[PDB]
Structure formats: structure tokens, C-alpha cells
Design a protein around this motif. Structure first.
Motif, PDB file in Angstrom:
ATOM      1  N   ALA A   1       1.016  -1.118  -0.045  1.00 37.13           N
ATOM      2  CA  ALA A   1       0.128  -0.126   0.021  1.00 37.13           C
ATOM      3  C   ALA A   1       0.831   1.154  -0.131  1.00 37.13           C
ATOM      4  O   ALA A   1       1.670   1.409   0.990  1.00 37.13           O
ATOM      5  N   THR A   2       0.840   2.058  -1.028  1.00 37.34           N
ATOM      6  CA  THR A   2       1.394   3.273  -0.991  1.00 37.34           C
ATOM      7  C   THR A   2       0.376   4.350  -1.257  1.00 37.34           C
ATOM      8  O   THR A   2      -0.753   4.220  -1.461  1.00 37.34           O
ATOM      9  N   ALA A   3       0.832   5.633  -1.471  1.00 40.17           N
ATOM     10  CA  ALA A   3       0.050   6.743  -1.750  1.00 40.17           C
ATOM     11  C   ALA A   3      -0.860   6.657  -3.021  1.00 40.17           C
ATOM     12  O   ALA A   3      -1.619   7.232  -3.134  1.00 40.17           O
ATOM     13  N   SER A   4      -0.288   5.694  -3.940  1.00 42.12           N
ATOM     14  CA  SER A   4      -1.012   5.326  -5.226  1.00 42.12           C
ATOM     15  C   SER A   4      -2.208   4.530  -5.172  1.00 42.12           C
ATOM     16  O   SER A   4      -2.956   4.087  -5.972  1.00 42.12           O
ATOM     17  N   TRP A   5      -2.448   4.141  -3.682  1.00 47.49           N
ATOM     18  CA  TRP A   5      -3.729   2.835  -3.529  1.00 47.49           C
ATOM     19  C   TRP A   5      -4.802   3.607  -2.857  1.00 47.49           C
ATOM     20  O   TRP A   5      -4.451   4.401  -1.626  1.00 47.49           O
TER      21      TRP A   5
ATOM     22  N   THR B   1      -3.623  -2.885   5.429  1.00 46.19           N
ATOM     23  CA  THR B   1      -3.429  -3.634   6.513  1.00 46.19           C
ATOM     24  C   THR B   1      -2.034  -3.428   6.917  1.00 46.19           C
ATOM     25  O   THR B   1      -0.894  -3.366   6.058  1.00 46.19           O
ATOM     26  N   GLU B   2      -1.710  -3.151   8.217  1.00 47.02           N
ATOM     27  CA  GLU B   2      -0.264  -2.899   8.498  1.00 47.02           C
ATOM     28  C   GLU B   2       0.299  -4.461   9.241  1.00 47.02           C
ATOM     29  O   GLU B   2      -0.383  -4.810  10.322  1.00 47.02           O
ATOM     30  N   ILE B   3       1.217  -4.810   8.798  1.00 48.31           N
ATOM     31  CA  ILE B   3       1.898  -6.062   9.353  1.00 48.31           C
ATOM     32  C   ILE B   3       3.243  -5.648  10.079  1.00 48.31           C
ATOM     33  O   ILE B   3       4.165  -5.012   9.182  1.00 48.31           O
ATOM     34  N   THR B   4       3.379  -5.881  11.157  1.00 51.88           N
ATOM     35  CA  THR B   4       4.669  -5.543  11.924  1.00 51.88           C
ATOM     36  C   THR B   4       5.575  -6.932  12.093  1.00 51.88           C
ATOM     37  O   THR B   4       5.038  -7.855  12.749  1.00 51.88           O
ATOM     38  N   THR B   5       6.762  -7.060  11.669  1.00 49.54           N
ATOM     39  CA  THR B   5       7.235  -8.321  11.527  1.00 49.54           C
ATOM     40  C   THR B   5       8.558  -8.030  12.465  1.00 49.54           C
ATOM     41  O   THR B   5       8.953  -6.653  12.787  1.00 49.54           O
ATOM     42  N   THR B   6       9.634  -9.008  12.794  1.00 48.85           N
ATOM     43  CA  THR B   6      10.718  -8.709  13.691  1.00 48.85           C
ATOM     44  C   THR B   6      12.009  -8.727  12.394  1.00 48.85           C
ATOM     45  O   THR B   6      12.892  -9.671  12.548  1.00 48.85           O
TER      46      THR B   6
ATOM     47  N   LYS C   1      12.283  -4.743  14.800  1.00 44.40           N
ATOM     48  CA  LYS C   1      10.747  -4.657  14.469  1.00 44.40           C
ATOM     49  C   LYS C   1      10.629  -3.717  13.345  1.00 44.40           C
ATOM     50  O   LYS C   1      11.253  -2.490  13.266  1.00 44.40           O
ATOM     51  N   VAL C   2       9.694  -4.184  12.471  1.00 44.00           N
ATOM     52  CA  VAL C   2       9.407  -3.286  11.155  1.00 44.00           C
ATOM     53  C   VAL C   2       8.103  -3.550  10.688  1.00 44.00           C
ATOM     54  O   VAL C   2       7.465  -4.419  10.676  1.00 44.00           O
ATOM     55  N   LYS C   3       7.629  -2.210  10.447  1.00 43.73           N
ATOM     56  CA  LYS C   3       6.106  -2.062   9.865  1.00 43.73           C
ATOM     57  C   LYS C   3       5.901  -1.812   8.404  1.00 43.73           C
ATOM     58  O   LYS C   3       6.544  -0.820   7.965  1.00 43.73           O
ATOM     59  N   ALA C   4       5.027  -2.740   7.829  1.00 40.75           N
ATOM     60  CA  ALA C   4       4.750  -2.426   6.228  1.00 40.75           C
ATOM     61  C   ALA C   4       3.351  -2.648   6.205  1.00 40.75           C
ATOM     62  O   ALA C   4       2.574  -3.228   6.741  1.00 40.75           O
ATOM     63  N   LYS C   5       2.681  -1.782   5.395  1.00 38.78           N
ATOM     64  CA  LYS C   5       1.385  -1.549   4.856  1.00 38.78           C
ATOM     65  C   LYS C   5       1.337  -2.353   3.345  1.00 38.78           C
ATOM     66  O   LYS C   5       1.849  -1.973   2.408  1.00 38.78           O
ATOM     67  N   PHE C   6       0.165  -3.061   3.369  1.00 40.35           N
ATOM     68  CA  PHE C   6      -0.273  -3.919   2.255  1.00 40.35           C
ATOM     69  C   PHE C   6      -1.741  -3.658   1.976  1.00 40.35           C
ATOM     70  O   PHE C   6      -2.506  -3.244   2.772  1.00 40.35           O
TER      71      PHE C   6
END
Ligand SMILES: [Cl-]
Length: 159
Positions: A59-63, A68-73, A75-80
Motif C-alpha cells: 500500500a502506497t500513496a497511489s492506492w 493492513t499493517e503488518i509488523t515483523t521482527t 521490529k519493522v512495519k509494512a502496509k499492504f
């Protein structure tokens, strides 16, 4: 998930996405299987619902849609991107492919194998193992779809 289950879930949406875009049916399927590990990679919404985001498209600004926000170790947060269905997900994927002029030849390929040639020429992945893996996936999917078709008619002649 199991390869048979994955194919059963994704075959129809990939076919419909292929009709919309011109990208070959089994190329879409092969890339989805390959990149999601036949659905082993699941990207869930916060409440556990599927995102249907089989490709892991960020998910970026073109969406405009839900994310949904996934946080992985660390620790790092990514938006899909979140979709309402696999059809919406694969439709968005081939639209993204279509949007990029470098992949034009993919959208006009007549076979999955030709489509894979087109991707490789366009430089989709720099690691040459990707093209090898895709070729094998496409072959595997062809055999699987043949086997499904024979389960159907083998069954029908029960009666
Ligand atoms: Cl991922």
C-alpha cells in the motif's frame, strides 16, 4: 496451502484477470503460486480476515483502498493493499503490470511460456533463478490442470 487447494481457489480469478488484461492465465497463476508459496504466505487484516493480497503488493500513496499493517521482527512495519476477493487482487496485479510500458509484450503474449519470455526480456527479476523457477511452475500448472480436467470427466462417467 496445498497446491491443489491453491489452484482450486485461484484458477477462476486468474482466468478472469487474464481476460481483462491479456496477460496469460497460467502466467498469472504461476507467478502467484511462486511468489506466495502456493498461499503459504498469508497477509491478514488486523481482525484476521484475508487481505487476498496474494502477491504482497504494498500500500502506497497511489492506492485508494483499505490497507493492513503488518509488523515483523529489530521490529519493522509494512502496509499492504487489502482486497475484497482474489479476483480484485489479481485484477489489480495485472493492472499494475499493464500500467508499466516496459511489460507491454506480457500483456500481448498468446501463451504462458511466451509471457515468461516477455517478462525475462523486460527484466522482471534480476536473479536468473526466478525465470527457471517460473518455467518449472508453468509446466507444473499445465500438468495439474490436465489432471483436474480428467478428474472431472472420469467422474462424470459415474452415471
Ligand atoms: Cl512478504
Amino acid at each position: 496451502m496445498d497446491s491443489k487447494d491453491f489452484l482450486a481457489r485461484l484458477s477462476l480469478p486468474a482466468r478472469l484477470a487474464s481476460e481483462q488484461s491479456g496477460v496469460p492465465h497460467h502466467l498469472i497463476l504461476a507467478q502467484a503460486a511462486l511468489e506466495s508459496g502456493w498461499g503459504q504466505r498469508q497477509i491478514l487484516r488486523e481482525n484476521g480476515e484475508p487481505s487476498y493480497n496474494v502477491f504482497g503488493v504494498k500500500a502506497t500513496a497511489s492506492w485508494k483502498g483499505p490497507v493492513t499493517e503488518i509488523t515483523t521482527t529489530k521490529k519493522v512495519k509494512a502496509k499492504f493493499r487489502v482486497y475484497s476477493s482474489y479476483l480484485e487482487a489479481l485484477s489489480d496485479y495485472v493492472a499494475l503490470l499493464t500500467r508499466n510500458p516496459r511489460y507491454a509484450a506480457v500483456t500481448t503474449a498468446a501463451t504462458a511460456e511466451q509471457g515468461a519470455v516477455a517478462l525475462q526480456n523486460a527484466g522482471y527479476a534480476t536473479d536468473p533463478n526466478y525465470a527457471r523457477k517460473l518455467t518449472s511452475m508453468i509446466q507444473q500448472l499445465k500438468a495439474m490442470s490436465e489432471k483436474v480436467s480428467k478428474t472431472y470427466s472420469a467422474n462424470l462417467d459415474n452415471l
